[PDB]
Amino acid sequence: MNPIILIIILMTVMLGTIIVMISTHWLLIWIGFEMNMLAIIPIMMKKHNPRATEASTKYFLTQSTASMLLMMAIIINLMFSGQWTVMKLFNPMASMLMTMALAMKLGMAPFHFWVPEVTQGIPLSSGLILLTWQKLAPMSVLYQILPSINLDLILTLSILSITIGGWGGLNQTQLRKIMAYSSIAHMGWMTAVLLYNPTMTLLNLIIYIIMTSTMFTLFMANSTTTTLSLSHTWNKAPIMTILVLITLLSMGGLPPLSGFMPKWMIIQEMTKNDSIILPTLMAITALLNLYFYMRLTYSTALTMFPSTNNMKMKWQFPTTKRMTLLPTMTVLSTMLLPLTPILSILE
Amino acid sequence: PFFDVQKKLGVDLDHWMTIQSAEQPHRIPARCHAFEKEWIECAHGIGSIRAEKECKIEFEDFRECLLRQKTMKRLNAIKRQRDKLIKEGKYTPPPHHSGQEDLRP
Amino acid sequence: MWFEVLPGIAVMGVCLFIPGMATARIHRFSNGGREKRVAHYSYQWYLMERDRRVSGVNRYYVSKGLENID
Amino acid sequence: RGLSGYSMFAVGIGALLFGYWSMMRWNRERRRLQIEDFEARIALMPLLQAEKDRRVLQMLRENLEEEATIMKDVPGWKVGESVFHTTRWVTPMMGELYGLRTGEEILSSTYGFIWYT
Amino acid sequence: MSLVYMNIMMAFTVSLTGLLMYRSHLMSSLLCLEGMMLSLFILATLMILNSHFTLASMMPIILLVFAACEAALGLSLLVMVSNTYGTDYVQNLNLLQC
Amino acid sequence: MNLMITLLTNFTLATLLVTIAFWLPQLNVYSEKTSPYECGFDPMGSARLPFSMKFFLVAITFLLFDLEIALLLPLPWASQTTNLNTMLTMALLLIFLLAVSLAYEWTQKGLEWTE
Amino acid sequence: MFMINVLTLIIPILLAVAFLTLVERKVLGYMQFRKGPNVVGPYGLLQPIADAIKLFIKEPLRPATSSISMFILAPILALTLALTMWIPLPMPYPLINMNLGVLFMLAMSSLAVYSILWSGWASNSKYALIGALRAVAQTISYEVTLAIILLSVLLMNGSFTLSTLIITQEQVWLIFPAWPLAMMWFISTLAETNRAPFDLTEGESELVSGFNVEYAAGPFALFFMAEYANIIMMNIFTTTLFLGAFHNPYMPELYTINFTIKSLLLSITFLWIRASYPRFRYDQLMHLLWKNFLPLTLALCMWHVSLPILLSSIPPQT
Amino acid sequence: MMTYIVFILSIIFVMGFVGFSSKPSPIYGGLGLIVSGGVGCGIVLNFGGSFLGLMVFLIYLGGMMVVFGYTTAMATEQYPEVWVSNKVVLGTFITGLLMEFLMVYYVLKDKEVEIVFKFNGMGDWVIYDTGDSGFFSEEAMGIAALYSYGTWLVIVTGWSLLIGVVVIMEITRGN
Amino acid sequence: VAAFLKNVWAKEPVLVASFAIAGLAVILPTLSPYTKYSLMINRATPYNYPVPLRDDGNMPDVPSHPQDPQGPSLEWLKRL
Numbered sequence A: 001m002n003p004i005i006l007i008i009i010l011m012t013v014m015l016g017t018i019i020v021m022i023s024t025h026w027l028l029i030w031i032g033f034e035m036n037m038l039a040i041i042p043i044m045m046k047k048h049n050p051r052a053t054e055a056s057t058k059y060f061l062t063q064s065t066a067s068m069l070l071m072m073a074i075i076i077n078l079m080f081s082g083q084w085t086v087m088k089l090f091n092p093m094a095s096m097l098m099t100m101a102l103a104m105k106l107g108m109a110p111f112h113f114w115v116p117e118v119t120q121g122i123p124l125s126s127g128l129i130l131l132t133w134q135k136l137a138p139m140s141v142l143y144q145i146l147p148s149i150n151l152d153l154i155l156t157l158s159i160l161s162i163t164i165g166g167w168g169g170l171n172q173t174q175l176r177k178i179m180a181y182s183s184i185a186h187m188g189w190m191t192a193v194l195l196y197n198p199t200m201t202l203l204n205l206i207i208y209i210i211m212t213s214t215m216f217t218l219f220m221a222n223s224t225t226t227t228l229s230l231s232h233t234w235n236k237a238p239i240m241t242i243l244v245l246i247t248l249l250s251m252g253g254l255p256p257l258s259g260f261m262p263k264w265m266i267i268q269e270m271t272k273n274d275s276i277i278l279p280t281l282m283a284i285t286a287l288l289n290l291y292f293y294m295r296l297t298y299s300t301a302l303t304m305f306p307s308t309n310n311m312k313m314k315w316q317f318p319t320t321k322r323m324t325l326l327p328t329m330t331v332l333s334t335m336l337l338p339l340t341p342i343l344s345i346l347e
Numbered sequence B: 001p002f003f004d005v006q007k008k009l010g011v012d013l014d015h016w017m018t019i020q021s022a023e024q025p026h027r028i029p030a031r032c033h034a035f036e037k038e039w040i041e042c043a044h045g046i047g048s049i050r051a052e053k054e055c056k057i058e059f060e061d062f063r064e065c066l067l068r069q070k071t072m073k074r075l076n077a078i079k080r081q082r083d084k085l086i087k088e089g090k091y092t093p094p095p096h097h098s099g100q101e102d103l104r105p
Numbered sequence C: 001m002w003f004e005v006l007p008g009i010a011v012m013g014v015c016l017f018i019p020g021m022a023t024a025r026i027h028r029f030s031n032g033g034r035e036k037r038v039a040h041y042s043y044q045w046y047l048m049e050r051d052r053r054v055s056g057v058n059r060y061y062v063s064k065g066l067e068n069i070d
Numbered sequence D: 001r002g003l004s005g006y007s008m009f010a011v012g013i014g015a016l017l018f019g020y021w022s023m024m025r026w027n028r029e030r031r032r033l034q035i036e037d038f039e040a041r042i043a044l045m046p047l048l049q050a051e052k053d054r055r056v057l058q059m060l061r062e063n064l065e066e067e068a069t070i071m072k073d074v075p076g077w078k079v080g081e082s083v084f085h086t087t088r089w090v091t092p093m094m095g096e097l098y099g100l101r102t103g104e105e106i107l108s109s110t111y112g113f114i115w116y117t
Numbered sequence E: 001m002s003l004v005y006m007n008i009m010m011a012f013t014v015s016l017t018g019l020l021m022y023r024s025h026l027m028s029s030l031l032c033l034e035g036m037m038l039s040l041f042i043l044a045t046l047m048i049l050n051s052h053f054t055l056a057s058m059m060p061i062i063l064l065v066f067a068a069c070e071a072a073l074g075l076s077l078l079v080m081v082s083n084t085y086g087t088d089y090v091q092n093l094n095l096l097q098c
Numbered sequence F: 001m002n003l004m005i006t007l008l009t010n011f012t013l014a015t016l017l018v019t020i021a022f023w024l025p026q027l028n029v030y031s032e033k034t035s036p037y038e039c040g041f042d043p044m045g046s047a048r049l050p051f052s053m054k055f056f057l058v059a060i061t062f063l064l065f066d067l068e069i070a071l072l073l074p075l076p077w078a079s080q081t082t083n084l085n086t087m088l089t090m091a092l093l094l095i096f097l098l099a100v101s102l103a104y105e106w107t108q109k110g111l112e113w114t115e
Numbered sequence G: 001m002f003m004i005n006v007l008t009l010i011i012p013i014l015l016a017v018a019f020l021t022l023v024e025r026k027v028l029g030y031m032q033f034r035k036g037p038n039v040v041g042p043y044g045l046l047q048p049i050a051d052a053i054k055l056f057i058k059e060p061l062r063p064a065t066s067s068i069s070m071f072i073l074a075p076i077l078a079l080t081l082a083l084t085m086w087i088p089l090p091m092p093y094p095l096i097n098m099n100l101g102v103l104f105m106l107a108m109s110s111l112a113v114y115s116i117l118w119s120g121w122a123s124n125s126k127y128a129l130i131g132a133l134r135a136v137a138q139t140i141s142y143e144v145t146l147a148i149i150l151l152s153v154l155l156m157n158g159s160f161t162l163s164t165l166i167i168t169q170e171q172v173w174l175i176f177p178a179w180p181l182a183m184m185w186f187i188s189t190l191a192e193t194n195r196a197p198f199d200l201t202e203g204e205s206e207l208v209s210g211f212n213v214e215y216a217a218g219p220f221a222l223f224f225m226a227e228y229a230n231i232i233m234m235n236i237f238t239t240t241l242f243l244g245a246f247h248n249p250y251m252p253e254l255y256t257i258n259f260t261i262k263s264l265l266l267s268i269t270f271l272w273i274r275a276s277y278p279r280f281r282y283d284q285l286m287h288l289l290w291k292n293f294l295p296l297t298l299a300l301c302m303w304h305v306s307l308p309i310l311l312s313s314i315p316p317q318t
Numbered sequence H: 001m002m003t004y005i006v007f008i009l010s011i012i013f014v015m016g017f018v019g020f021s022s023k024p025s026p027i028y029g030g031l032g033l034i035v036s037g038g039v040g041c042g043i044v045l046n047f048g049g050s051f052l053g054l055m056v057f058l059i060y061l062g063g064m065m066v067v068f069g070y071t072t073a074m075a076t077e078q079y080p081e082v083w084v085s086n087k088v089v090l091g092t093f094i095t096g097l098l099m100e101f102l103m104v105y106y107v108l109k110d111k112e113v114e115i116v117f118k119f120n121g122m123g124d125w126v127i128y129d130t131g132d133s134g135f136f137s138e139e140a141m142g143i144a145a146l147y148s149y150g151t152w153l154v155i156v157t158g159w160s161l162l163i164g165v166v167v168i169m170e171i172t173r174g175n
Numbered sequence I: 001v002a003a004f005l006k007n008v009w010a011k012e013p014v015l016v017a018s019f020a021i022a023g024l025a026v027i028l029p030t031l032s033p034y035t036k037y038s039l040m041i042n043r044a045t046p047y048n049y050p051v052p053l054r055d056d057g058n059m060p061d062v063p064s065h066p067q068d069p070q071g072p073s074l075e076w077l078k079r080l
Ligand SMILES: CCCCCCCCCCCCCCCCCC(=O)OC[C@H](COP(=O)([O-])OCC[N+](C)(C)C)OC(=O)CCCCCCCCCCCCCCCCC
Pocket: D009, D012, G180, G182, G183, G184, G185, G186, G187, G197, G238, G242, G273, G277, G288, G291, G292, G293, G296, I011, I012, I014, I016, I017, I020, I021
């Protein structure tokens, strides 16, 4: 792609997310989502192979269906309220349709059927854009409509996302599908604490974006897209195995790491509201995520899978890659738990 | 993340199409301008939790201005009872509900 | 010579004169010898419906002047 | 054969300037005529507003004096009960005025302007 | 509410189930997204013209704009499916199943 | 009302010029006169094969430029406003954005046809 | 008595199409050094009646491969949309006085493409397929400038009302402030109405009869009397836009005679162009209305927005 | 039954939606969507939106001409399904029509109905305004306000159309 | 700059006319004295009713009759 056009298209993706974040009018929310989808489609088709075209077709169909349901929720709100302010919704039908639309845009289960497909089809950089930056505009709209979100719907979507994203990653050897089912489980964690304390929703979103950006930057820095090619990293750059070790143990929710920070706080806000069964099932179901994270740490860091002969040539060449903010994101994704009361800045 | 840039910078990007009671072109009122003005001036600043129960009456009048559900239900009752009394023959319509009435102006 | 297209052009010109002349005479016949009232805007329609109400014969074109008042 | 380029462009730009001048004068005259027609409308509007008020109050009283005759056998009916909690005047709906009248008056009053030619 | 909103919401749901149940042909369902845009147009416009909220009268135009501004997007994504494969059948787009 | 009467009249005596075009002459049907036309010879294959469009990028960009005359069309009414320099700036912004779009489609050879 | 007002519209323009066929053939003859029809009637004044009787007693020949419902519905909609674009045209008084009659003309121009389009698809033939998708290439070419030219000329009118376009042109013709728009609109109406050099759908040298190659007589008549109705309506529309005549409200027949003879001169100009110019190729069509007419149309749109503000000559909307 | 004209046009709207939503073929899908978008500019034209109905008619005529060109170029099969060729097309076509006229029958007999919302059964002439707008059609004034009041909406819409052209030319490249 | 202008007028004259007309439409309304009168005509076109004021006692600029000398006048539009 022409880099001026790449700059303009990425600024337009960012502009769509900002127009969703800053606007007080429902039509401008919908315009921001349309602009976001429309601009991110050529980021997915950066390589022009059939898998990117398939991923872009599936992504276009899911996000277009979600935006249709979003605009129908907006028009039913216009009927039952005569106004356009981005606030609570004045009808449970519009509340359900907008919650369905935002759950489709997040790829939360049972609308999850596009996130491993689309994430596998596209490159690692566009997969990073998909799993981090596209989880900011629907979480804005969910942060703004929580007086009208049905409790049973968002909790069913949340625990169904956590369970399905837990079981999905166990059967995977492709790193992008692992990160996609990890995305599904983590969006379930974020939306389960949405009606109890949305500050914990924002905390989980930020810590998740840090850890996911760390993992995709490590994958891009190692040029690995499968488990079995990530397993050659000890013979090429052994510090990267340590970084994926600490980041995957962080993403599993293990103390003393920062990925234990959101989970615990979510439990800390769900037991206040006399819900004991639900965060317990969520915590126990997160052990599946931890299990396929531990599978990746076994294949990469804790053992040494056999490499090839041609790796001896790659010993003679360093990385000329822009590993942008990789030590900063690696430190923030692992050693941030003693700074856990920083979450009050998200109030 | 409602990063309220429009109030921080003082710009009016989309506050003008937000409600019906805003500044309209050529001062055109909506059909529910008074109802929406009463509901917004009731519910201003008291928060949504107090607004859902302390300004319920103005919002019910405004919603029934918008969709006219009670009005159309009452007209259903009046027209259905009128058609029943025509079918039973126990009522005849007046001449000003038939045309021959030499209308007002 | 070239002027033999003029009968066909003349008959075509008559056949194009007929619709405009026809709708002008029909507008003058259906409206009491005057133009058809143009109501592009709802105020013009309100004045026309007021004329229909004040004519007494349920026709907007029947005008009532100062002879109607005392 | 024919003229040069500069002569034809000069004739074209002169035709542009003549058309712009003539349309300038005539559209300014048309705006003055529009303001005259609007001030005639404004001067008529109080009489039309008073007649419109007496018109709609006539029709609502006729719909009210005939509501009590229809609604006599129905138990618990409250004749002329407002559907609004407020006691403010509400502008009447089309069904509130022409709800008891014939379909000719209904069509001519609620689709008359749109369907008119 | 009013009688016409029943059928315009009904047309939205008919086009919804037509979109959301594919008949192995991608153009036949890209028509259904355009029909959902038509139904949303007519529904919002009936609501706006009804209540005389005149400043939102520019809203359906804008809505209609983004209609084709994604429909064209779908057609630009229809031709890449129909250049990789001879047809635009949606069951040819199953490579990302593994 | 008069519009639907006029359209009903036009459709009526457009379909009553067809029902007296089929039912008035004498029909002689045999299965070679109703065959398709390929200049006398039999047509090789069906005409329902995909006839590949060369002007496809122009056809998709027509969908976007046709929206512009849903945006540039209220300009006779937008000129009647009392915030008029703002209207003029936004109008020239829309035609300038259409022109920047057309310039980008020119220079990247999007207006040319394929093959 | 409105039904008579409809029947005094469409029947005199099913006759003006008939004698337009005779005028087309005779002006085409005398510009090609020969004579036209002068055998059937007195100097050809019965040849249209001869063709109109011949076309409706010939065997209609519905094909075996043709999708018959769209095959019959496409000439019905052709003549329907040919007739129904005459109703907002002020002659000086239109049949149906629309507040937005220009956009009715534009939308029914967009709908009349589907008669050609479904006729070319329905008759399952390879030459009628090519003549169908050349209408797509022609319609994505003229429509992208047919609306901005017509926008820019109504920025001096003030509205989309065709009757107000007589009041607009009461001092001067609107061809004097808008002659580039006029000489671009005229070519756009050539490209719209499928007249030469923009035939391109019934392109006889390439495609034997084009989109209606399977339509035998009877249904062929309703594409042949629809296109000519489109050229008479289109030159009346161009006359209303750019050559608006004097209207006396007490003598409408003066306006009717004046715009009638002007629209006849523009129809003779269409016949002059069809008899003198080589026909385009349907990509060179598209590189004309996009590479040439569309940038200058955007420039004149900027100019006709900014110029009534520049001269305090914004026309009224009432 | 002439007071029910917007309701009758809305029945034809739903019939066109069942016509193209059964998905016979995008030829007939474009046919049904033209029929629905042409009666939908008669539904909304009886509410006062004469500008705002002619545009959804005209934009969708251009749209279905483009979609016709693509379904003759890309989405074409040897035997296209008209309305009745497939049993799954005709079955759901008859299903949508019978359910639509079923909820016609339940709303004219009872004058009220409830599918998720509650709907009246009287003709929708009842809800119109009993006043006049003077020398302006108010929807034309509101769409005219897109330039004076809607400046940010102009900026985001024109930017979205610009990058729509750029996005589409970046997709349809192949390399 | 003149040789390139002659070159583009020789090769692509339609685009030269396009950029010339567009440049005039950009710069020329900012250089005209009549652009003020466009706004002054548009805000003196009375669509709505001039809703009167309750006379409190101290409003010297507001008239009591339309034919009074005080108030906004349109003599500038009559002369021009
Ligand atoms: C409406 C009433 C009638 C109006 C007049 C119409 C009658 C005359 C019709 C004659 C017969 C035409 C038959 C069809 C012909 C089709 C071909 C054709 O016309 O192609 C168009 C041709 C195309 O030429 P071309 O195809 O050779 O172009 C070459 C292009 N390249 C190099 C890319 C290959 O010309 C145009 O496009 C010009 C259109 C009109 C231009 C109007 C310009 C007005 C003045 C602008 C400003 C100039 C001064 C500079 C600025 C000054 C500022 C102060």
